[PDB]
Amino acid sequence: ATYKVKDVTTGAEIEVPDDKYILDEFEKQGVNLPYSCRAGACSSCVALISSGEVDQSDGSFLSEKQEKKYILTCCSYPKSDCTIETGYEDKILEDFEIELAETGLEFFNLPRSGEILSGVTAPFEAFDHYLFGNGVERSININDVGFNINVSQIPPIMSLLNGKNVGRFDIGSDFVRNTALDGYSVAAYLGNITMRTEGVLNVKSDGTWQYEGVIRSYNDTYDANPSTHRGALGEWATGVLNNLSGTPYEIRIPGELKIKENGKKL
Ligand code: FES
Ligand SMILES: [Cl-]
């Protein structure tokens, strides 16, 4: 039989006999491709295979898991129509990194889009999205993050409560939230964010006070590259980033958190 082998890199579509190697037949039709050994023992001729199947049993360089994703074009016979991407030598991954992507898809899943699942997996999902999400925006409602914000932690409010100010004050101010205050799980994907509180603070002459309002969040940019933030990644995440490049992305945090507190200054 013969099969059609479409190559996304060059655009060529070549009929390749099931008893001829893909490289040789593309060359025969005038499409020059990369190679070195031509003997199955290197990655010069490697191509991504996105659809179809080959017999590349003549080659030796790729692992069993790598052969699910890539082909050595010098020693591959097509067994069905195929879609490949030549010149992929610069982009092939080793087993531990192919399986990291697969696992994340299956564990968290359109995939790697929209809402982030609330709870203990959030910083894991966020890191996986950094690695494999290609910069697509994600979201989590402010009420699903697990913020634990109190007035003592909001300097625009405390500035009025700490001075001798009596009356009714309309507060509308941004402030930086170090989400370490909200727990390691949140800090591990949000870090420092900018938030906004809007509300009313009422302070009596005797020091009794009440605050009522809302808190909203501006969008945050997720970027795990260590030079862009405060946190230790740890040895495992450092390792992953020594082998894969991620893509920053925006996290949209919509909604209002209600805040209502009261006290008495002495
Ligand atoms: S050119 Fe070395 S494996 Fe194909
Ligand atoms: Cl004062």
Author numbering: 2 to 110, 116 to 272
According to the publication:
The bimodal distribution of the selected ensembles suggests discrete populations in solution, the more compact of which is similar to the conformation observed in the P21 crystals of pectocin M2. A form with the radically different space group of P3121 was chosen for optimization, which yielded crystals diffracting to 1.86 Å. These values correlate well with the extended population from the DMD simulation, suggesting that this structure is representative of the second elongated pool indentified by our modelling. Alignment of this elongated (P3121) form and the original P21 form, based on their cytotoxic or ferredoxin domains, show a major difference in the relative orientations of these domains. As the elongated conformation of pectocin M2 has comparable dimensions along its length we manually docked this model into the barrel domain of the hemophore receptor HasR, a TonB-dependent receptor shown to be responsible for importation of the relatively bulky substrate, haem. This docking illustrates that pectocin M2 in its elongated conformation could traverse the lumen of such a receptor to gain entry to the cell, with the flexibility of pectocin M2 observed in solution allowing the protein to adapt to the shape of the lumen of its transporter during importation.
Pectocin M1 and M2 consist of an M-class cytotoxic domain with lipid II degrading activity, fused to a plant-like ferredoxin domain (Grinter et al., 2012a; 2013,). This ferredoxin domain, which contains an intact [2Fe-2S] iron–sulphur cluster, substitutes for the helical receptor binding domain and IUTD of the M-class bacteriocins discussed above, that are required to deliver the cytotoxic domain to the periplasm. We have previously demonstrated that Pectobacterium spp. are able to acquire iron directly from plant ferredoxin under iron-limiting conditions through a receptor mediated process and that the bacteriocins pectocin M1 and M2 parasitize this system for cell entry through presentation of a ferredoxin domain (Grinter et al., 2013). The lack of an IUTD indicates that the ferredoxin-containing pectocins utilize an existing ferredoxin uptake mechanism to cross the OM, without direct interaction with the Tol or Ton complexes in the periplasm.
